[PDB]
Amino acid sequence: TSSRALPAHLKLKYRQESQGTEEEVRKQDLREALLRAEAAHFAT
RNA sequence: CGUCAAAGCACUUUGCAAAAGCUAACGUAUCUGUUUCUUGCCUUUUACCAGAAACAGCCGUUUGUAAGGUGUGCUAAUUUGACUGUAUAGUUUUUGUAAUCU
Ligand SMILES: [Mg+2]
């Protein structure tokens, strides 16, 4: 109907294996990782 | 060419589905549009300039399959596939050095 209403980007992208899917974040331990990263930045 | 098998066959209309897997012309051809950037010309918008990225559209192509049409056939025609396919008594196999007994 209009130029900007034409079909475009018909394929929705999903997070892949290494991009941080729900499974990987659920398996991961975010608390300890956050603590190590905070300590590492403090070290500088 | 031959044997066997199943399929009517040749041309054609329409529907449905698919088309890179091992780097490669579905198309030895070739247009347009949108978004986000960087540019050109620029008094403001459309229309624009010419490069990129990500997306789409249109003109076409191929294959499979389903249902039909035309012309010829089923008192045969053609097509597709498969095949460990050929002679021959005259020494290297299939027209017998056999029987005899031990
Ligand atoms: Mg004004």
Side-chain angles (χ1 to χ4, degrees):
Chain A
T1 313
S2 177
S3 63
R4 301 169 88 144
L6 303 166
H9 278 101
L10 307 156
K11 191 260 177 186
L12 204 64
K13 284 217 266 198
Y14 300 111
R15 285 182 184 252
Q16 288 294 70
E17 178 66 31
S18 66
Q19 319 193 175
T21 43
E22 271 155 328
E23 308 325 323
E24 276 200 344
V25 187
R26 210 162 31 220
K27 302 307 141 199
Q28 218 185 333
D29 173 337
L30 311 164
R31 174 161 321 193
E32 190 268 351
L34 160 76
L35 286 166
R36 68 189 68 187
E38 271 192 59
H41 170 257
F42 184 21
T44 64

